[PDB]
Automatic annotation (TrEMBL):
Signal peptide residues on this chain, from the entry's feature table: none
Full protein segment contained here: 170 to 903 of 905
Protein name per the record: Ectonucleotide pyrophosphatase/phosphodiesterase family member 1
Keyword vocabulary terms for this entry: Biomineralization, Calcium, Cell membrane, Disulfide bond, Glycoprotein, Hydrolase, Membrane, Metal-binding, Phosphoprotein, Repeat, Secreted, Signal-anchor, Transmembrane, Transmembrane helix, Zinc
The organism of origin for this protein: Mus musculus (Mouse)
The protein's assembly and partners: Ectonucleotide pyrophosphatase/phosphodiesterase family member 1: Homodimer. Ectonucleotide pyrophosphatase/phosphodiesterase family member 1: Interacts with INSR; leading to inhibit INSR autophosphorylation and subsequent activation of INSR kinase activity. Ectonucleotide pyrophosphatase/phosphodiesterase family member 1, secreted form: Monomeric.
Length: 726
């Protein structure tokens, strides 16, 4: 009988022919197989359903942005964001090479496009052979290496021939046989484009690839390998239905210009035509502002690339144009109707948290659990996983090694929390006080005389954030209601942590132009009220909100300490004040309290990681005759319990939400004219949600280290991001 007809049985030990010391791994891509195809038509796909039911499955594998074939396939086999592995789209221009990349051109085989270390190169360096029957990058010499058996891409090769060849490769003698294999099919991507994702044609394509996977499995069974092979069935992205009525043309606002080139689609990019001469001198900001807030409920938004949501990690490469566009679901953008393909086809490329962009993942074999359904994870985590299946040490990458251990019968790698590399000190009281220039109102209660586990636990119930910032000088400042990690190198707080219960009340009093000098920290001129007084360029904001006073009735005066302020634009205060005066109270009511950590972010070189000291010094600004460092973003992490009966101080299990809010000196991003503040501030927050791990990378902080969950369980928590359901 066939493999699909056999009953599902646990493979607790690999059942291998004597000529196999261990099971191979096969990575099998079904291009453009959106996660929902299996949600809805699983009854029509018996083979893929058995792999899912007898294996390890997630309803949604999150792809990378932009959700295109080449960036995502290459992310899968490198563990890297496209901005790091260099393949940021199927078509690219590189201003330093002055070259264009495309899939149907000679440049596809130019090794200079492909960065990082794909898994077959990792394997080569560690004496493991590879056999690839198509995979982006696998027919290109990368690090002077090619797969041991590889095929130049040719989409005309019949699907059956591809599967048959891998089955012959598996019969080679040990000294020639690969241990890692790839297979790739162009369906159901092709039918999804030509006829739309919801069509009888896509269904026929799904049935066709399901039959083909069964041909593979039956071949493995014939070879005695169907219980000696770790199968990863995967896709690169999902599929959306495009419309000629949902297509933006920039010539509507710019006129019929030809001095710019637009990469059309849902993740459009813009550069001048006169390159490389004007690639950097072109006035991108003027163009972006001419395209901002032009329509009510505008379905596209221009972004200079450092200002895109950090969760997309789409800016560091010089192949990413300085101007990009963010598109609503189902919408696309081109310069004009002549600079695009057909406007009514299936398409992809959109935000990688859109539901219809989500991808397929099934793991089947000795190493994978049987009948396990796990929460969503990003495809950059798969490289580490394949390294564990193959016995390989991973190259440095963006996956969190160990975060997928719950997919495995017997985890290979036991992860550890990162060490604290900061220099921690106690900050003593200095008895010298200076005039800050403040004009505190009469109802503000002064701190007349300046000169603890329970208080400590209340403020940091999961352990204090750890300082990963190498050799950075930090002292902890304890208050009754919050804890501060204070930077002695920057003279501003790196984080503040406090807990906010459902019944806690906020104060109504004003506290304008009022601060109290923290005698435990060195006094800076940019600590004083007089620095920010009538300062049109810059104001200051608080990390812990002074209106929150759990025990007393007035403004919480300890939150007015100079150790609790950060430089803050007036425009961003609209967001920050609404967040802390309105949203936080509702979230505490919805979540039975929330614990909060917030702080500044400095990522001036837009690489998603904290800046070195030399980078900070280069980006200092003189404002009112003083050097000042203005954060690029502000982060906030909200934690509460899975069970609503528990307060954030007694959680059996954690519920985490994180955000990395851009710190812009206007609110043009939100097109605020005619909108309720309730709507647009919360909409901005949702768009700029992030993984906890994203916050960790960009601040050099590590969270939750005193929790009793295993490190791998905490990595799952910290790598999660909610999908926007359509
Ligand atoms: C995703 O993982 C990537 C791999 O670890 C990581 O990229 C690495 O980033 C570092 C720092 O930018 C680079 O290291 C060196 O870079 C230059 C020389 O090119 C030096 O001046 C630096 O001091 C440093 O020694 C690595 O070259 C780079 N590796 C790769 C493959 O790109 C990304 O930073 C990670 N992304 C995020 C958001 O965490
Ligand atoms: N919008 C759109 N792009 C397509 C379609 N078919 C192929 N492409 C794009 O054209 C390139 C080559 O596709 P392949 O030849 O199917 C890729 O960048 C792919 O995304 C289609 O029907 N619509
Ligand atoms: N290794 C490859 N080299 C070149 N083109 C490829 C390769 N793999 C897939 N393709 C093509 O990429 C296109 C699909 O891209 P996408 O629509 O972004 O999913 C189709 O034209 C495929 O034939
Ligand atoms: C860039 O390359 C193109 C070839 O595609 C060539 O026409 C142009 O002269 C080059 N520009 C420079 C500055 O070398
Ligand atoms: C692509 O594959 C088909 C196999 O059916 C073959 O006819 C064609 O010649 C191949 N193209 C190249 C360039 O090898
Ligand atoms: C629109 O573009 C022009 C450049 O042609 C620029 O001078 C102008 O400042 C832009 N408008 C806005 C509102 O930024
Ligand atoms: Ca940085
Ligand atoms: Cl690059
Ligand atoms: Cl391009
Ligand atoms: Cl629009
Ligand atoms: Cl597309
Ligand atoms: Cl195994
Ligand atoms: Cl715990
Ligand atoms: Zn694809
Ligand atoms: Zn496609």
């Amino acid at each position: 009988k066939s493999w699909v007809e056999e009953t599902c049985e646990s493979i607790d030990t690999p059942e291998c022919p004597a000529e196999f010391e261990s099971p191979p791994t096969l990575l099998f891509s079904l291009d453009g197989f959106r996660a929902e195809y299996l949600h809805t038509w699983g009854g029509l796909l018996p083979v893929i359903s058995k792999l899912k039911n007898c294996g390890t499955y997630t309803k949604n594998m999150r792809p990378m942005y932009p959700t295109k074939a080449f960036p995502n396939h290459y992310s899968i086999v490198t563990g890297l964001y496209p901005e790091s592995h260099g393949i940021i789209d199927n078509k690219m221009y590189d201003p330093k090479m002055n070259a264009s990349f495309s899939l149907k051109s000679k440049e596809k085989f130019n090794p200079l496009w492909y960065k990082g270390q794909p898994i077959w190169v990792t394997a080569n360096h560690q004496e493991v052979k590879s056999g690839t029957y198509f995979w982006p990058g696998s027919d290109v010499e990368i690090d002077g290496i090619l797969p041991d058996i590889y095929k130049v891409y040719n989409g005309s090769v019949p699907f059956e021939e591809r599967i048959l060849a891998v089955l012959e490769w598996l019969q080679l003698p040990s000294h020639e046989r690969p241990h890692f294999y790839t297979l790739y099919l162009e369906e159901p991507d092709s039918s999804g484009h030509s006829h739309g994702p919801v069509s009888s044609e896509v269904i026929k394509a799904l049935q066709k690839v399901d039959r083909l996977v069964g041909m593979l499995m039956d071949g493995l069974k014939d070879l005695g390998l169907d219980k000696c092979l770790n199968l990863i069935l995967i896709s690169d992205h999902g599929m959306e239905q495009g419309s000629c009525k949902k297509y933006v043309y920039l010539n509507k606002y710019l006129g019929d210009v030809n001095n710019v080139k637009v990469v059309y689609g849902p993740a459009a990019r813009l550069r001048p035509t006169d390159v490389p001469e004007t690639y950097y001198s072109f006035n991108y900001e003027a163009l972006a502002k001419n395209l901002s807030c032009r329509e009510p409920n505008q379905h596209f938004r221009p972004y200079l690339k450092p200002f895109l949501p950090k969760r997309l990690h789409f800016a560091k490469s010089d192949r990413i144009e300085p101007l990009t566009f963010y598109l609503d679901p189902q919408w696309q953008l081109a310069l004009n109707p002549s600079e695009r393909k057909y406007c009514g086809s299936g398409f992809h490329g959109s935000d990688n948290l859109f539901s219809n962009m989500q991808a397929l993942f099934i793991g089947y074999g000795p190493a994978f659990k049987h009948g396990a359904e796990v929460d969503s994870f990003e495809n950059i985590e798969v490289y580490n996983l394949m390294c564990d299946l193959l016995g390989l040490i991973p190259a440095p990458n963006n996956g969190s090694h160990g975060s997928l251990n719950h997919l495995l019968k017997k985890p290979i790698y036991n992860p550890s929390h990162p060490k604290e590399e900061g220099f921690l000190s106690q900050c003593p009281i200095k008895s010298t006080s200076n005039d800050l220039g403040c004009t505190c109102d009469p109802w503000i209660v002064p701190i007349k005389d300046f000169e603890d586990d329970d208080i400590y636990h209340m403020t940091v119930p999961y352990g204090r954030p750890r300082i990963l910032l190498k050799q950075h000088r930090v002292c902890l400042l304890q208050q009754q209601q919050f804890l501060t990690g204070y930077s002695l190198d920057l003279l501003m707080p790196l984080w503040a942590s406090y807990t906010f219960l459902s019944n806690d009340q906020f104060s109504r009093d004003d506290f304008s132009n009022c601060l109290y000098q923290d005698l435990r920290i060195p006094l800076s001129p940019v600590h004083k009220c007089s620095y920010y007084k009538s300062n049109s360029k810059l104001s200051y904001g608080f990390l812990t909100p002074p209106r929150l006073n759990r025990v007393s009735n007035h403004i919480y005066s300890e939150a007015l300490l100079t150790s609790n302020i950060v430089p803050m634009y007036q425009s961003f205060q609209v967001i920050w004040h609404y967040l802390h005066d309105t949203l936080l109270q509702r979230y505490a009511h919805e979540r039975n309290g929330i614990n909060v950590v917030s702080g500044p972010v400095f990522d001036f070189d837009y690489d998603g990681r904290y800046d070195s000291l030399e980078i900070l010094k280069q980006n200092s600004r003189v404002i009112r005759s003083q050097e000042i460092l203005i954060p690029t973003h502000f982060f906030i992490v909200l934690t509460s319990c899975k069970q609503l009966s528990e307060t954030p101080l007694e959680c059996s299990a954690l519920e985490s939400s994180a955000y990395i809010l851009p710190h812009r000196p206007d609110n043009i991003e939100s097109c605020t004219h005619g909108k309720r503040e309730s709507s647009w501030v919360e909409e901005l927050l949702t768009l700029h949600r992030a993984r906890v791990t994203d916050v960790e990378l960009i601040t050099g902080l590590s969270f939750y280290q005193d929790r009793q969950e295993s490190v791998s369980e905490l990595l799952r928590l910290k790598t999660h991001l909610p999908i926007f359901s359509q």
